Design a protein around this motif. Sequence first.
Motif, PDB file in Angstrom:
ATOM      1  N   UNK A  90     -36.230 -60.759  -8.203  1.00 41.90           N
ATOM      2  CA  UNK A  90     -36.745 -60.884  -9.554  1.00 41.90           C
ATOM      3  C   UNK A  90     -36.468 -62.289 -10.064  1.00 41.90           C
TER       4      UNK A  90
ATOM      5  N   UNK B 170     -43.124 -58.528 -15.955  1.00 45.34           N
ATOM      6  CA  UNK B 170     -42.523 -57.506 -16.791  1.00 45.34           C
ATOM      7  C   UNK B 170     -42.208 -58.109 -18.149  1.00 45.34           C
TER       8      UNK B 170
ATOM      9  N   UNK C 127     -30.440 -57.769 -24.890  1.00 42.99           N
ATOM     10  CA  UNK C 127     -29.403 -57.016 -25.578  1.00 42.99           C
ATOM     11  C   UNK C 127     -29.294 -57.417 -27.045  1.00 42.99           C
TER      12      UNK C 127
ATOM     13  N   UNK D 136     -31.425 -59.100 -20.393  1.00 47.26           N
ATOM     14  CA  UNK D 136     -32.361 -58.010 -20.605  1.00 47.26           C
ATOM     15  C   UNK D 136     -31.659 -56.674 -20.410  1.00 47.26           C
ATOM     16  N   UNK D 137     -32.027 -55.693 -21.233  1.00 49.72           N
ATOM     17  CA  UNK D 137     -31.555 -54.332 -21.009  1.00 49.72           C
ATOM     18  C   UNK D 137     -32.616 -53.258 -21.212  1.00 49.72           C
TER      19      UNK D 137
ATOM     20  N   UNK E 217     -37.015 -52.474 -20.750  1.00 47.42           N
ATOM     21  CA  UNK E 217     -38.246 -52.987 -20.155  1.00 47.42           C
ATOM     22  C   UNK E 217     -39.192 -51.841 -19.823  1.00 47.42           C
ATOM     23  N   UNK E 218     -40.437 -52.207 -19.516  1.00 45.77           N
ATOM     24  CA  UNK E 218     -41.383 -51.308 -18.887  1.00 45.77           C
ATOM     25  C   UNK E 218     -41.458 -51.556 -17.393  1.00 45.77           C
ATOM     26  N   UNK E 219     -42.575 -51.136 -16.797  1.00 48.58           N
ATOM     27  CA  UNK E 219     -42.752 -51.299 -15.360  1.00 48.58           C
ATOM     28  C   UNK E 219     -43.653 -52.458 -14.962  1.00 48.58           C
TER      29      UNK E 219
ATOM     30  N   UNK F 128     -24.482 -59.715 -15.310  1.00 48.36           N
ATOM     31  CA  UNK F 128     -25.043 -58.378 -15.328  1.00 48.36           C
ATOM     32  C   UNK F 128     -25.345 -57.888 -13.920  1.00 48.36           C
TER      33      UNK F 128
ATOM     34  N   UNK G 151     -27.804 -55.192 -11.880  1.00 44.42           N
ATOM     35  CA  UNK G 151     -28.990 -54.354 -11.975  1.00 44.42           C
ATOM     36  C   UNK G 151     -29.174 -53.634 -10.653  1.00 44.42           C
TER      37      UNK G 151
ATOM     38  N   UNK H 231     -32.346 -51.817  -8.410  1.00 41.57           N
ATOM     39  CA  UNK H 231     -33.771 -51.568  -8.278  1.00 41.57           C
ATOM     40  C   UNK H 231     -34.022 -50.489  -7.242  1.00 41.57           C
TER      41      UNK H 231
ATOM     42  N   UNK I 277     -39.653 -48.925  -9.288  1.00 37.55           N
ATOM     43  CA  UNK I 277     -39.026 -48.937 -10.599  1.00 37.55           C
ATOM     44  C   UNK I 277     -38.410 -50.298 -10.890  1.00 37.55           C
ATOM     45  N   UNK I 278     -38.575 -50.748 -12.125  1.00 36.38           N
ATOM     46  CA  UNK I 278     -37.954 -51.982 -12.576  1.00 36.38           C
ATOM     47  C   UNK I 278     -36.436 -51.887 -12.456  1.00 36.38           C
ATOM     48  N   UNK I 279     -35.754 -52.982 -12.131  1.00 34.22           N
ATOM     49  CA  UNK I 279     -34.292 -52.951 -11.967  1.00 34.22           C
ATOM     50  C   UNK I 279     -33.524 -52.369 -13.145  1.00 34.22           C
ATOM     51  N   UNK I 280     -32.645 -51.413 -12.843  1.00 36.27           N
ATOM     52  CA  UNK I 280     -31.847 -50.717 -13.847  1.00 36.27           C
ATOM     53  C   UNK I 280     -30.510 -51.400 -14.093  1.00 36.27           C
ATOM     54  N   UNK I 281     -30.220 -51.695 -15.363  1.00 36.63           N
ATOM     55  CA  UNK I 281     -28.952 -52.312 -15.730  1.00 36.63           C
ATOM     56  C   UNK I 281     -27.867 -51.258 -15.660  1.00 36.63           C
TER      57      UNK I 281
ATOM     58  N   UNK J  21     -22.766 -54.550 -17.538  1.00 33.44           N
ATOM     59  CA  UNK J  21     -22.909 -55.795 -18.266  1.00 33.44           C
ATOM     60  C   UNK J  21     -21.539 -56.398 -18.539  1.00 33.44           C
ATOM     61  N   UNK J  22     -21.553 -57.705 -18.847  1.00 34.79           N
ATOM     62  CA  UNK J  22     -20.356 -58.524 -19.101  1.00 34.79           C
ATOM     63  C   UNK J  22     -19.333 -58.383 -17.981  1.00 34.79           C
TER      64      UNK J  22
ATOM     65  N   UNK K  47     -23.297 -49.709 -18.783  1.00 33.11           N
ATOM     66  CA  UNK K  47     -24.316 -49.525 -19.799  1.00 33.11           C
ATOM     67  C   UNK K  47     -24.324 -48.070 -20.262  1.00 33.11           C
TER      68      UNK K  47
ATOM     69  N   UNK L 116     -28.724 -56.458  -8.070  1.00 33.54           N
ATOM     70  CA  UNK L 116     -28.853 -57.876  -8.378  1.00 33.54           C
ATOM     71  C   UNK L 116     -27.687 -58.369  -9.221  1.00 33.54           C
TER      72      UNK L 116
ATOM     73  N   UNK M   9     -26.981 -61.156 -11.790  1.00 36.85           N
ATOM     74  CA  UNK M   9     -27.633 -62.107 -12.688  1.00 36.85           C
ATOM     75  C   UNK M   9     -26.634 -62.841 -13.574  1.00 36.85           C
TER      76      UNK M   9
END
Lengths: 129, 129, 132, 132, 108, 108
Positions: free
Chosen positions: D45, D96, D101, D119-120, D122-124, E34, E36, E38, E42-46, E49-50, E55, E87, E89
């Motif tokens: 990404x 995307x 946050x 970022x926390x 989002x869509x697809x 952060x 994430x 994936x 599906x878009x990468x899930x957080x 964090x910190x 989350x 990931x 980040x």
Amino acid sequence: AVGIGAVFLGFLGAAGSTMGAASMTLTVQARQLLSWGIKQLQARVLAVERYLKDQQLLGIWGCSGKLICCTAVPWNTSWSNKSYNQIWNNMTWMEWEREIDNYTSLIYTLIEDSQNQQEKNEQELLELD
Amino acid sequence: AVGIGAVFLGFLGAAGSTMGAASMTLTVQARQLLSWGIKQLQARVLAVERYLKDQQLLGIWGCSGKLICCTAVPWNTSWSNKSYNQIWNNMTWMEWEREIDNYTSLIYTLIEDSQNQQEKNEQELLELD
Amino acid sequence: QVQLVESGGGVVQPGGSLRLSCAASGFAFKDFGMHWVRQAPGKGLEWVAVIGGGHGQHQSYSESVKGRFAITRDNEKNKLYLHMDRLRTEDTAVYYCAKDRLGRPWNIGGRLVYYYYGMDVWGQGTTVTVSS
Amino acid sequence: QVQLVESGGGVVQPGGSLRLSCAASGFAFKDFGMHWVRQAPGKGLEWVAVIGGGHGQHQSYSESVKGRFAITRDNEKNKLYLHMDRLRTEDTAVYYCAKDRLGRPWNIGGRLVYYYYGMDVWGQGTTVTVSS
Amino acid sequence: AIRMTQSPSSLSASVGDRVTITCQASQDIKKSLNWYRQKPGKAPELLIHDASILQTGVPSAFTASGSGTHFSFVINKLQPEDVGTYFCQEYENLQFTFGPGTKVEIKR
Amino acid sequence: AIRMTQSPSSLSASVGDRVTITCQASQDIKKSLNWYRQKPGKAPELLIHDASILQTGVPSAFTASGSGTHFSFVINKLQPEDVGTYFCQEYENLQFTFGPGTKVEIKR
Ligand SMILES: *[C@@H]1O[C@H](CO)[C@@H](O[C@@H]2O[C@H](CO)[C@@H](O[C@@H]3O[C@H](CO[C@H]4O[C@H](CO)[C@@H](O)[C@H](O)[C@@H]4O)[C@@H](O)[C@H](O[C@H]4O[C@H](CO)[C@@H](O)[C@H](O)[C@@H]4O[C@H]4O[C@H](CO)[C@@H](O)[C@H](O)[C@@H]4O)[C@@H]3O)[C@H](O)[C@H]2NC(C)=O)[C@H](O)[C@H]1NC(C)=O
Ligand SMILES: *[C@@H]1O[C@H](CO)[C@@H](O[C@@H]2O[C@H](CO)[C@@H](O[C@@H]3O[C@H](CO[C@H]4O[C@H](CO)[C@@H](O)[C@H](O)[C@@H]4O)[C@@H](O)[C@H](O[C@H]4O[C@H](CO)[C@@H](O)[C@H](O)[C@@H]4O[C@H]4O[C@H](CO)[C@@H](O)[C@H](O)[C@@H]4O)[C@@H]3O)[C@H](O)[C@H]2NC(C)=O)[C@H](O)[C@H]1NC(C)=O
Ligand SMILES: *[C@@H]1O[C@H](CO)[C@@H](O[C@@H]2O[C@H](CO)[C@@H](O[C@@H]3O[C@H](CO[C@H]4O[C@H](CO)[C@@H](O)[C@H](O)[C@@H]4O)[C@@H](O)[C@H](O[C@H]4O[C@H](CO)[C@@H](O)[C@H](O)[C@@H]4O)[C@@H]3O)[C@H](O)[C@H]2NC(C)=O)[C@H](O)[C@H]1NC(C)=O
Ligand SMILES: *[C@@H]1O[C@H](CO)[C@@H](O[C@@H]2O[C@H](CO)[C@@H](O[C@@H]3O[C@H](CO[C@H]4O[C@H](CO)[C@@H](O)[C@H](O)[C@@H]4O)[C@@H](O)[C@H](O[C@H]4O[C@H](CO)[C@@H](O)[C@H](O)[C@@H]4O)[C@@H]3O)[C@H](O)[C@H]2NC(C)=O)[C@H](O)[C@H]1NC(C)=O
Ligand SMILES: *[C@@H]1O[C@H](CO)[C@@H](O)[C@H](O)[C@H]1NC(C)=O
Ligand SMILES: *[C@@H]1O[C@H](CO)[C@@H](O)[C@H](O)[C@H]1NC(C)=O
């Protein structure tokens, strides 16, 4: 990891550490030093005289109540040309006192004859006017 | 990561942020506000009168030269019973001024009639004796 | 150069005792703080004890040895001692002497404190066996 | 609930253009700062750009897209836009939209600054292909 | 933003094992990290964090730690459901750079 | 002193590979960490002190990083000469606890 003693310097040990570090326990050392019948009676009187002798000078010099007091006598670098840090962070009380042993009476005289004299003369003049 | 503007508030934007944060740019806002021929001539004279009007009050109140000055008039909690933090960290300048709009003339009067009066009377008495 | 000569070991019975003596030179033994560590066969290295520099005015013992071992030192002989008393079979290990990175009695806060940052100099130890 | 509806994609030629539009609800779009990211097939990404909340008085672009893409927003439509101009085949990716946050214009130091912490939400995304 | 690196690029274990991902910065980023995850389609899930805080809504199946330049992501037990690319980040500066990503899968 | 843990207990690689040892504290120790390397017949050799600084005379073949609770020892290239057990020691408190030690060897 650090090992520690209880509270503070026991007695005189700081004499061989730098004067800077040693200054921390002047309150300790001073208190400890400051405070058959006939021989002891004599000793008691002598202790009093020694006690009061120091108090006399501290009174005259405007230092009474302090264990650290600044005077208004400049340092003559002839006595020692070391800088502040070259003395205080590098030399012990035993060593320092020896370095300037032969100037003790000189400087003590200067404190009284010059500064004390000035402070008493000018004090009266300021109070008058 | 933080994005930043150039230097400071452009103009009036802080009016909707808390009074605490807004106080940062009073120097900016004040300077900006403070500073065909006949119509403009009239406007100029009016600008002067508005300028001097504010200066008169700031002079009288003992606030001249300051954008922040403390008075000696107590806050009557009847006007608002909010605490210091409940106001300054929670309310904007636009909102605050409305809250106490009907006390403006009251408090302004109190500053002059009570404090200014006292300061001038007592000042002379202190200078005399 | 720096050399630690670590001896005084051997084989003792449980309930017996010995004392180890680590002679050292090449450095100011009298000034630096020292360590004791031990390694049992098949195990990692266990810390035993520490003694500060100078006259050794501060110590710490591992809970596994406290009350059974004592640390001392002789600044003229340049020898570090471990008094290995009332021993158990669990005390079988090679024992090492070591020097801390610093261990000095700093005058700070009106009192002496010993700053340790871990062992960095040592010999090869000696085997002490406790068995019957 | 929170939902991003990300469309405006399709297939364009290199040298052409399109604009993506990410409609969103379930949150105060007008207040939070937003992100653009993209993922090319077979790659990870890549961050594309950020726009602050409110009216978006601050932006940052990836060096890989600066001068070729622009970010804007409409706080009444609740839509986030990516102007995808003068595109190259290297720009093929799924793009995307995302919410930071925080992203808010804090009044600090006499000036507005936008605090981002990543970022926390989002869509697809949607696929944009640049090819010939 | 400082380039992040992750290792190994291909990480696998049997189900239930403890699986960790190494991630490092070439320069001190202090804490701005952060994590994430994936999954295909599906878009990468957080998840974290910190650099250490889960989350909201994420189960306590993952931890992370480290500061400065050395960080790690810990999968307490790798389940088939946890297969995906994780990931690393950095968001210290406004480039919000993503690391290469590490693929975590079940051995077969 | 806070208990240290090391993982894996058995770590191996071919010659020249990059080999790392995980070491963690159950509680924040800030930085007070030494790395030692033991070879058969020899007392453990100090390689890195204060969690990152090579000991004088040690070649730049090793690095380490981490702070707080998460630390790592890095062998830039594992050579036959580097075979030994590496220890993670904490010296924050006067127990100077050693970790379990990790054995690093050459694959065969
Ligand atoms: C530089 O010079 C100094 C000055 O001499 C020198 O330090 C002195 O070393 C000796 C020997 O280590 C110290 O003697 C010990 O003193 C303690 C103090 O006890 C008093 O204070 C406690 C305070 O709570 C009271 O409870 C107690 O009732 C006393 O009032 C003694 O307790 C020690 O006795 C034990 O150790 C002896 C060792 O031979 C035994 O023979 C004795 O029976 C006691 O043994 C018990 O304890 C052992 C602990 O390890 C244990 O193993 C035994 O099994 C048994 O349970 C001891 O007499 C003296 O205090 C030191 N002086 C100062 C000022 O510190 C330095 O050694 C020297 N430095 C160098 C480098 O040479
Ligand atoms: C709330 O309301 C505000 C107020 O209207 C509104 O903000 C305004 O948005 C518009 C549209 O984005 C902004 O208009 C831009 O203004 C700049 C300013 O140029 C001046 O200042 C620079 C300073 O260096 C000078 O160099 C310059 O010579 C001018 O003096 C313009 O440069 C922009 O023009 C470009 O963008 C246009 C977009 O349509 C193009 O049509 C135009 O040809 C220019 O295009 C070039 O740049 C593009 C950059 O992406 C590039 O893609 C093109 O290919 C080409 O290279 C533009 O006119 C206006 O400044 C904003 N006003 C303020 C006060 O910020 C908010 O949008 C609104 N908020 C919401 C949420 O609705
Ligand atoms: C008998 O007397 C001597 C007097 O010299 C004692 O030895 C010294 O004692 C002083 C304190 O009493 C120590 O001073 C401390 O030094 C630190 C500097 O360390 C650097 O330099 C040395 C040089 O050898 C390096 O080895 C070392 O690795 C470092 O590179 C300072 O950092 C210390 O500062 C502390 O105090 C300030 C106070 O504000 C704090 O702000 C600081 O954060 C810090 O806490 C301090 O100045 C000195 O190091 C001692 N020398 C040695 C070689 O260790 C003897 O210990 C004494 N013996 C007895 C019986 O007490
Ligand atoms: C229009 O006006 C509003 C006024 O409310 C602006 O929104 C707020 O702006 C202020 C500053 O102008 C922000 O204040 C900062 O809040 C921090 C608290 O964060 C905690 O609480 C929030 C509650 O929502 C949580 O979301 C958050 O996660 C935290 O739990 C403080 O920590 C900040 O302190 C800073 O200043 C002090 C100064 O001494 C420093 O010492 C601190 O270290 C720190 O730097 C500060 O007080 C406030 O957060 C804003 N609100 C929101 C919800 O973000 C709008 O932004 C403004 N719009 C425009 C156009 O500017
Ligand atoms: C002053 O410091 C130097 C540092 O090397 C030292 O050699 C010298 O002995 C010191 N002076 C005193 C009074 O100890
Ligand atoms: C004061 O703070 C509370 C916090 O919830 C908020 O609801 C209220 O609107 C604030 N007051 C003002 C003047 O905004």
